[PDB]
Each structure stands twice: as structure tokens, then as C-alpha cells.
A paper describes a structure:
haptoglobin forms a stable complex with a haemoglobin dimer. Trypanosomes take up this HpHb complex but not the individual components.
P3121 with one complex in the asymmetric unit. as a search model, allowing a poly-alanine model of TbHpHbR to be built. binds to the heads of HpHb, where its two constituent components come together. from the membrane distal tip of the receptor and directly contact haemoglobin. interacting as far as 70 Å from the membrane distal tip. dimer with no contacts between the receptor and the haemoglobin α-subunit. why the receptor binds HpHb but not haptoglobin alone. haemoglobin that is formed by helices C and F of the β-subunit. residues K56, S59, K164, R199 and Y200 of the receptor. their C-termini, can simultaneously bind to one HpHb dimer.
Author numbering:
A (entry chain A): 2 to 142
B (entry chain D): 38 to 297
C (entry chain B): 3 to 143
D (entry chain C): 148 to 153, 171 to 406
The structure:
Amino acid sequence: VLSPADKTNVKAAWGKVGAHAGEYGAEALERMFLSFPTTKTYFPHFDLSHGSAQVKGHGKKVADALTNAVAHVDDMPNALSALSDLHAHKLRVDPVNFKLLSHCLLVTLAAHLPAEFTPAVHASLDKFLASVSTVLTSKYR
Amino acid sequence: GLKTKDEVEKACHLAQQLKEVSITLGVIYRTTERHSVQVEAHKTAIDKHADAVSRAVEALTRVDVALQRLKELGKANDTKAVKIIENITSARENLALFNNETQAVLTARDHVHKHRAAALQGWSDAKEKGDAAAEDVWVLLNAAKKGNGSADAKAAAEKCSRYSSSSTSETELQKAIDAAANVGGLSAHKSKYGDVLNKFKLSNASVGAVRDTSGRGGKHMEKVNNVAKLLKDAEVSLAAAAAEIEEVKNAHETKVQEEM
Amino acid sequence: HLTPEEKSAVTALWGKVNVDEVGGEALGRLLVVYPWTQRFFESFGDLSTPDAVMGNPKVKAHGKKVLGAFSDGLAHLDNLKGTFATLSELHCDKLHVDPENFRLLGNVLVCVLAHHFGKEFTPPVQAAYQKVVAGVANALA
Amino acid sequence: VCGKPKGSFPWQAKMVSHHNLTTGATLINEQWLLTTAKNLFLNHSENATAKDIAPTLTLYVGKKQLVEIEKVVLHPNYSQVDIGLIKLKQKVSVNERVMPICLPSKDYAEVGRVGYVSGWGRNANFKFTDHLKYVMLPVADQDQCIRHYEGSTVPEKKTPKSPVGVQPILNEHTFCAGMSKYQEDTCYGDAGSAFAVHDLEEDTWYATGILSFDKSCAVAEYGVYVKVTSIQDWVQKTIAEN
Ligand code: HEM
Ligand code: HEM
Ligand SMILES: *[C@@H]1O[C@H](CO)[C@@H](O)[C@H](O)[C@H]1NC(C)=O
Ligand SMILES: *[C@@H]1O[C@H](CO)[C@@H](O)[C@H](O)[C@H]1NC(C)=O
């Protein structure tokens, strides 16, 4: 559950990210692929080399989705319905992977927005990404 | 310093038991969480009961305010009023029981928290003291690995683990302290050892009090649940009684007006 | 297993860590982000707010001890099992700590390193630290 | 015989689907377990029968003790009451690690009641837990829970409000439970596990509910459980007949 205080923390931290969201998304994927090689199996036809344009493109889509969730924190399931069917039913992404990407996004934010990444903000963002991860996996069977 | 195998073994055992104090107590303390959860659940249930019985309570209050007016008119001896009062006396008795048992539950809840806070503080003090005393013993044990002192003393010091093989107790800690009384270097810290043992006993006893208090609370809560249901079940007949006595009171008001 | 190149990037980074602070900050954050961990540490006194947690002397002190054990692990990457056998016996057999919490602390530590090192905490250095935290978690389990 | 644990949840079983998804089941006598209909249908077509399902399941109790299944019985109204029964080919041997939980005579699904829910579900890292864990949870107010997932207790005012994007089955046959003091919840694979209540007068443990909605994961606020008292007669008849 995101409290009003969490929502404020998320909106502020993501407001600082601003236009860097695509770059941060691409770096979180890059960190995920390199730290947890098993994730690469979901992208057999991607160029996953450092600086791949295909990864920068995907990082931008992932970031846009998160931006959209931040904009609609009170109605996240609805905002993410198409994505939730995509990930759970069509792609069948095991829930573990969402925790890997969530960790890598937090690492990316900590490295890029040190001023903003206080303990309370870290708790709020972990909770936000846990809500996104749950919405995207609740249909998995 | 520790120069014999015997001194090293007595010091080793003591250091382990002092270090074990915080570990054993954390485990014991964590058994009180179920009681904190239970007593918080009692409070929520009491709030729900209080809400559920409020209509029955409101009817009983309406009955008393109609009766007070009948007393003012000198008509409280009206046979219908008397009959209504007799009919509602079980509910009046049940309301007094509900008030008393809920208060007993809430006092037990306060006592659980108070004993838990003492157990926590006891654990924290025991750890502060225990870890420090174990560190002072380790100064001697570490020094005993080198220099003078027998090869057997050094080997025993090299073998000494930081941790006890099992959980400690008042008996085991006391046994370790008493054995170490014979050891020169350790003897300087005897009062420190005593305070650690008293904090262990205090924490442990507070945990026992949490458990006993929580049991008493649960018995009171069962009575609360039973009497709350009896009051809710009487709600409709209590509302009927409040209207009847209000009618009686209204007829006596109009009889007084018409008689002036 | 760490390439010698990875062992190198890791110890290179570690050499720059404020040994007196990052331990308390990683433990402090574990307690704020994953509050159920507090039940092992309620003996630390006031943990009621993130500032109370982060500023608590007992959190700081205990943090130093945890970090110290990670430092020992770094000196023995080849034998983490043997190095952590006594500690595993404490956490496992005496404390009954769910082994998932070791991974959470490790991950919080990675976040702290990212927080303090920024850009220097590159994806390849993260990947090497992920091997270390997993290795330390498995050895503690 | 039942509900006297020496190790802490000897009634807990672990079910594994043909596609390696872990779920829960609960031992209710020496030869029968309760679980959910959703658990049973994992990796099956919505048109599968009990006969199709049964030979595709793997079940363990105690310290990895594989037990062979004879058959499965789906609740006749499983879209309303998310339940199934599992019959073993033979009785389990009861000991300190394997023992049934008692079925209750009283309705312990009241606010003011605290239950222990053990489970093999996914943990904080979304990995199926290696070690059995449990949560202590309080029974929550039914209306609070209904409003959380459905917006209103009034049928014409209901809307799908579930914070996780999937709706639980909520009705007169179910109860809700909250989240732990330390905000721990149930998650994927925990369904089929018992909401166990300790009757202090008898000093016995009872299955008050079977976890149905195991998708809250500390995102939605409540787990939803099938009330054992509401299926007790059906359970007894089924066991007596098979
Ligand atoms: C915060 C978590 C995540 C978000 C917000 C997210 C978002 C999305 C988005 C927006 C798309 C593009 C839909 C489109 O093609 O138009 C998608 C596709 C995809 N996602 Fe996810 N995703 C997440 C996590 C996962 C994870 C953890 C994996 C696997 C490890 C996964 C694997 C995929 C794959 C394989 C595709 C399809 C690639 C393609 O054909 O374009 N993502 N992602
Ligand atoms: C994975 C990295 C971890 C490391 C390197 C680590 C390190 C250690 C060390 C070195 C000590 C021993 C200090 C002493 O008493 O002599 C210890 C004690 C302890 N640790 Fe850990 N630990 C880790 C994770 C955990 C986690 C996840 C928890 C539980 C949430 C845990 C809870 C404890 C407790 C309760 C103590 C005992 C303090 C006492 O009462 O004596 N730590 N830590
Ligand atoms: C997963 O299930 C398949 C059979 O459907 C098979 O690979 C194996 O039995 C399971 N995998 C593991 C690692 O146990
Ligand atoms: C199944 O549903 C119908 C609904 O009216 C009910 O009459 C019947 O008794 C239910 N069966 C069981 C076993 O609950």
C-alpha cells in the first residue's frame, strides 16, 4: 500500500529524474542483464551489447510505463492493464525477474540522484516498484 | 593473565555465556510478539463491540431519562414503568458486565505492554552489559594465545569459540560466573558479571508476566464476547421498552397539564 | 567466482569506503525499507522513525560489525563458506534468521555503495559486487 | 490426533504443479487435505475434471515426504467457494512433523481473533521460499475488506477496486485478514494454507480459513480466506463417501 507520504516521495524523486528516464531505464536493463544473466533469456532477439540502440529504445518504453504509473499512482492497475496481460499471459515472465529489475532501477536512481535517495525515499520507491511488480505479475499462472 | 589450560577454559566458558545472554534473550523476547498482537486484537474487537451494542445502550439511556422524568412527576411507581424496568434488568446487568469485562481486558492489555517494555529494556541492558563483559574476557583470551603460559593454555585459547553451543539460563550463567571466581584476571569484573545475570533474570521474568497477563486478558475477552452478543440480541426489545416508557411518561405529562 | 579483474575492481572500491559509516547506513536502511527485520534488533532502542533509525548509535555500532565481516569476506573470496561457518551457525542455528534477509541486506549494501560512488559504481562493478553479496548470503545460509 | 503441535505447522503440505509452481494444502485428517480450486487448476484448461488434474500433481508433507494422491474432489460450487479436497492413497504416518489440524465447531472468523498462516509462497524477493515461514495476522472487518476491493457493500455501487488488478472472490462464505505488525503479508503460492486459530480453553489448533486470495503481497491490504465452518458439512460428506 502506498501512503500519501510515499506518493509524495515517489512523485518528487521521479520529477528529479525528469527527462533522464529513458537513459536510466536503459542503464537499469544493462545492469540487470550483466548482474543476472538469466534475464537475457526473455530477449533472445535483442542486441544486448553495451550501448545497444535496441536496449536504449526498450529502456525508454520501460521508463514511459513507470512515468505513467507515477502519474496514476491511485489507479495503477488500470493504467497498467495492457502491460499486465502482456507480461503475465503472453510473455510468462516469472515474478522473480521483476525483483531483479526493481533492484537495478533502485541502484540506478541511487547512483544518479544521491541527494534525493534518502532512506525514506528509498523505502517509498521500493514500495512503488513492488506495487508495479505485483500489478504486472498478479495474472501469472 | 590466563596461564593454564584450566584458567583458559573457565574464561572461555564465561565469555561464551556472557555473549549468549543477548542471543538467548532476543529469542525469548520474540515469543512475546504473539501476546502484543493478541492484546491489540482485543482492543479492536472491543471497539467493534462498543459500536455494535450502541443501539442497545441508547435504548437503555432513553429508559433512564423517561424514568427520571417520571420520578420528577411523582409517577415512577406507575405499574407499567415498574414492569418495564423489571423486564430490562437483565440488559442493565449485561451492560454493567460488558463495562467491567472490557475494562479488565483493557487493563490486561496495558499490563502486557508494560511487561513487554520491561522485557525489552531488560534485554537491551543485558546485551549492553553482557557484550562489554565478554569483550573484557576476550582481551585475556586473545593475549593467552601468545607468549608465556603453557602450550596447553595457548592451544585451548586457539580453540575457544565466541559462541556457546546452546542457549544460556540463570543456572548456566551463574555456574560460569562461580567457576571464574577462582581466576585472578577475571575476578576484577565480578560485579559486572552479577549485573548481567540480574538483567537476564529480570528480562526472563517480565516475559513470564507477559504470558500470564495475556492468559487472564483472554479469559476476560471471552466474557466480553458473550455479553456483547446478549446485548445486541436484546436491542429490538430494548427499543420497544424505551418507546413504551416514553408513552407512559407522555400520558402522565398530559394528565398533569389537564389537571392544572 | 571472481575473475582476478573483478576481485581487483571490488577491493579497489572497498578501499575507498568509509568503514565507520556505510555499515550503519546499510543496516539502518534495511530496518527502514524492510521493517520486519527490526524484530532482531528491537534491543537497539528508538527505531520509531527513519531519522531515529539512521541516527541511533547502536545501529551505527552494530553496522560497523557487519561491515567488518564483509571486509573479512573480501579477504577470502575463495573460501566464504569456511570464513562464515561460525557466523552461519549463529544466524542459522541460534537465531533462525530467514536466509532471504541476508540477500536483502546485501542488496541494500549495493544500493549504499551506488549512493556513495555514483558513476564509479558502473554496471560491471555492480555485477562483481552482486557475486560477493550472493556469496556472502549463501555462506551465511 | 489433531491440532496438538509439538514442527510448528505439521498440518502444512506443499503442492507442486506439473509446470513447477508451488502452492499450499492443509492436512485435515490422516488421508485428506484441503486446498483451493485455483491451485488445482494451475497448468490446466478451465474444462479439466478432477480426473485430469489428480495424476499431474506432486505433494509433500513434513521434511520433504512425498505422498501419493488417489483422487481430487472439486467443490461443486468452486466459483463461489474456492476449494478442493485431496485424497491420499494411504494414511500419512503422524509424528512431530506431520499431523492434521482440527476442523472447528465454533466460528473463530471474528475481529479480535489472531491467526497463524504458514506457507510455501513467494517471499520478499519473489522466490519460492526455501524454508517454511509464517505470518501472524488479525481477522479484519468484513465491510472494510469489501470496500477495499469492491468500493461498496451495495451491489449496484460495486466497482473493481483491487490494488493488484485481480479481484478476490468475496462473499458470505469468506473472511479477510490483515497484515502483520511488521507489514508482512501472504503472496503467490500461499493459497491453500490454513488460517490457524489457537483455542486457549482446549489448547487446540483449528483451521478457521483456507487462504484463497494469495495475491495481496502487501500491496492490497487483505488476504481472503474460505470459512471452514461454511464447507464443513460438504467436507464430512465427501470424506464419508470416498
Ligand atoms: C518495472 C518492470 C517492467 C516494466 C514497467 C516493463 C515494461 C514493458 C514495456 C512498456 C514493454 C513494451 C510493450 C511494447 O512492446 O509496446 C515491455 C515489453 C517486454 N518486457 Fe517488460 N517491463 C518490466 C519488467 C519486465 C521484466 C522483469 C522482464 C524480463 C526479465 C520483461 C520482459 C519484457 C519483454 C521480453 C518484452 C517484450 C520485448 C518486445 O518485443 O518489445 N520486462 N516491458
Ligand atoms: C548478510 C550479511 C550479514 C552479515 C555480514 C552479518 C554480520 C554479523 C556479525 C559479524 C555479527 C556478530 C557480532 C557478534 O555478536 O559478535 C552479527 C550478529 C547478528 N546479526 Fe548479523 N549479519 C548479516 C545479516 C543479518 C541479518 C539479515 C539479520 C537479521 C535481520 C542479522 C541479525 C543479527 C543478530 C540478531 C545478531 C546478534 C547480535 C547479538 O545479539 O549478539 N544480521 N551480524
Ligand atoms: C520443471 O518441470 C519440468 C517438467 O514439466 C522439468 O524440467 C522438471 O521436472 C522441473 N525442473 C526442475 C529444475 O526441477
Ligand atoms: C451449491 O450452490 C447452491 C446454490 O443455491 C446451493 O443450494 C448448494 O447447496 C451448494 N452446494 C454446496 C455443497 O454448498
